[PDB]
Design a protein around this ligand. Structure first.
Ligand SMILES: [K+]
Ligand SMILES: [K+]
Ligand SMILES: [K+]
Ligand SMILES: [K+]
Ligand SMILES: [Mg+2]
Ligand SMILES: [Mg+2]
Ligand SMILES: [Mg+2]
Ligand SMILES: [Mg+2]
Ligand SMILES: [Mg+2]
Ligand SMILES: [Mg+2]
Ligand SMILES: [Mg+2]
Ligand SMILES: [Mg+2]
Ligand SMILES: [Mg+2]
Ligand SMILES: [Mg+2]
Ligand SMILES: [Mg+2]
Ligand SMILES: [Mg+2]
Ligand SMILES: [Mg+2]
Ligand SMILES: [Mg+2]
Lengths: 91, 151, 210
RNA sequence: GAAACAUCUAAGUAGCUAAAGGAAGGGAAAUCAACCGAGACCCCGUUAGUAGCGGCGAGCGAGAGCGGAUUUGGGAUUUGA
RNA sequence: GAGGAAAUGGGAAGAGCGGCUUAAGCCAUUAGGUGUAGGCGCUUUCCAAAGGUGGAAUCUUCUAGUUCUUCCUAUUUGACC
């Protein structure tokens, strides 16, 4: 019928501003991957903060200790943090 | 009965008030009584055609000697924004009016405005303000006066 | 060479390091495959940095989190220690009101104020005088330390245009605009402040219950 | 290109066609802001690879404000009655 | 006859200043000088967001960086041929 997905589609087509067809920026700037943005946050330490996986569903699969453990935020491993450091994620 | 009938602020009227119609009466009102309706009439005269310095100087002295030096300071601010040339003797009465009511910080503010306008005062006034700042516990303002008197 | 500056003997502090021209003979050490090894994709130069080999990457196996607040307010933090040091340096007048304009002119505030000044409690053991402040926010330790010496802190409200008119009043007179008027706080910001700021910079404080 | 591919990208690009001028187009708010205010239109810098869009993947990517260049508004339109 | 150019990032060596530095532009070119808009730091550390925020040392106190040049690499462009 009228669910939240098509309600949001009808709302976004009419009220959200539209992307320009062509660019205006003449300078070339570096862009990293768009999947970094909502998932990672750089700290002033120099390490990058992340959140652990497995908390979306399937909570009957996990032990109590693992359920308590996945609540705790963690850090990106170094070999993967160097890539986003080199691709201008930490500014 | 002229000012309550807003005759000055009428556009279709042609004959305006002569300079001699307000030049002595502002002097008399400021020197021998109240300054408030004098400044009300002259602020109405600004809204049509008048920026005479004589009535402004007399309003400054009248507001100083009445007992409200804030009005003298704001009229000097009006002169500064309108570009009216500012004298040295006007700030002396403002400084000593601040002095007489026990506000040496306001006196130092007015002294700074006088110096930024470009008038050097005398060492007698310097000696008055430095002792008044020191005896009120405001040591650092007195030291800031000392800086410019050294310079 | 007695103070001689000729164009025949100019040289730098260290000798210039030149380019590594790859692909020349055997003796240069970087010829015949340069530095690329033998065959593959990294020798043909068609490899993108950050690719992981077909495994699902770490940037896609981890969950997203949270939302972005577009109305977030940023206040510049000043500690009591810097203000006390500048008091002892004779650059801030201790007997007048300490506004935000005073801090911006002395340089305790950086180049870009954004939404106001937050007063911090660092170096609180250097405060020996009754000081009067007018900031945007203040922490519990800073307010306690100031009022234990006998001063007062007033949390005061400016908006963006009011902050521009407080800090740069010459910017309006170069543009030909009149000085604006201080706006009232919005109802979500009403509880966070005490009073509306005066747009000329005030130099006499206002006691609370006096 | 997405290490395949179908929404997406390449891209309103290449190409084909029509009309007009030395320039064309746009233009003086049924415009932005936020209870404080700005004041037509086009071009250059910054905001900013940020907000936003997106098999929320690969990718695409503003506006307002602020600093410059040019600086311009005219008409309906005013009324003695 | 085949590792090269620009712009933006990660670093190393050298230098300027002590907060550092301009972009478009403007005034002159037998040639430079100006231009504060902006960027980074000081700065405050957790946090989805609201919210919240005592560095060290005791003994004349320590408490920050930024902009260029050269070279090695990365991204976008045909990208060693
Ligand atoms: K392929
Ligand atoms: K295929
Ligand atoms: K570089
Ligand atoms: K350095
Ligand atoms: Mg497009
Ligand atoms: Mg070898
Ligand atoms: Mg060979
Ligand atoms: Mg190699
Ligand atoms: Mg290989
Ligand atoms: Mg081979
Ligand atoms: Mg092989
Ligand atoms: Mg493909
Ligand atoms: Mg398209
Ligand atoms: Mg075409
Ligand atoms: Mg023609
Ligand atoms: Mg034309
Ligand atoms: Mg209005
Ligand atoms: Mg403009």
């Amino acid at each position: 019928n009228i669910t939240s997905k098509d309600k949001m589609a009808k709302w976004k087509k009419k009220w959200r501003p539209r992307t320009p067809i062509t660019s205006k920026v003449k300078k070339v700037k570096i862009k990293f991957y768009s999947s970094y943005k909502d998932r990672f946050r750089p700290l002033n330490d120099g390490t990058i903060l992340r959140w652990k996986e497995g908390k979306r569903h399937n909570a009957h699969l996990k032990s109590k200790k693992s359920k308590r453990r996945l609540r705790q935020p963690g850090l990106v491993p170094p070999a993967y943090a160097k890539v986003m450091k080199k691709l201008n994620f930490c500014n | 009965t002229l000012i309550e009938k807003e005759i000055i602020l009428r556009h279709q009227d042609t004959l305006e008030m002569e300079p001699s119609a307000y030049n002595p009466i502002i002097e008399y009102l400021c020197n021998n009584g109240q300054t408030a309706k004098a400044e009300v009439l002259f602020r109405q005269l600004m809204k049509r055609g008048v920026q005479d310095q004589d009535a402004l100087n007399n309003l400054i002295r009248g507001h100083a000697k009445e007992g409200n030096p804030d009005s003298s300071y704001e009229i000097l601010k009006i002169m500064s924004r309108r570009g009216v040339p500012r004298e040295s003797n006007a700030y002396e009465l403002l400084i000593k009016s601040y002095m007489s009511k026990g506000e040496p910080g306001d006196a130092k503010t007015a002294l700074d405005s006088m110096v930024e306008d470009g008038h050097v005062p005398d060492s007698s006034l310097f000696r008055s303000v430095i002792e008044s700042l020191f005896e009120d516990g405001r040591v650092q303002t007195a030291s800031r006066v000392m800086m410019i008197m050294i310079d | 060479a007695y103070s001689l500056l000729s164009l025949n003997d100019l040289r730098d502090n260290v000798p210039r390091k030149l380019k590594t021209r790859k692909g020349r003979g055997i003796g240069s050490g970087k010829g015949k495959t340069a530095g690329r090894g033998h065959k593959g994709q990294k020798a043909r130069g068609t490899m993108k940095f950050g690719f992981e080999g077909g495994q699902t990457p770490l940037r896609r196996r981890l969950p997203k989190r949270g939302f972005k607040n577009k109305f977030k307010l940023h206040f510049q933090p000043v500690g009591l220690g810097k203000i006390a040091k500048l008091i002892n340096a004779g650059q801030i007048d201790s007997h007048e009101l300490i506004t935000m304009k005073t801090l911006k002119d002395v340089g305790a505030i950086g180049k870009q104020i954004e939404d106001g000044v937050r007063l911090m409690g660092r170096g609180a053991d250097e405060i020996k005088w009754p000081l009067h402040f007018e900031v945007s926010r203040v922490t519990v330790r800073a307010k306690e330390v100031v009022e234990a010496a006998g001063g007062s802190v007033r949390r005061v409200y400016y908006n963006k245009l009011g902050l521009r008119a407080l800090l740069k009043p010459e910017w309006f007179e170069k543009k030909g605009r009149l000085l604006p008027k201080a706006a009232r706080p919005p109802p979500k910001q009403l509880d966070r402040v005490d009073s509306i700021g005066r747009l000329p910079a005030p130099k006499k404080p206002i006691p609370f219950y006096a």
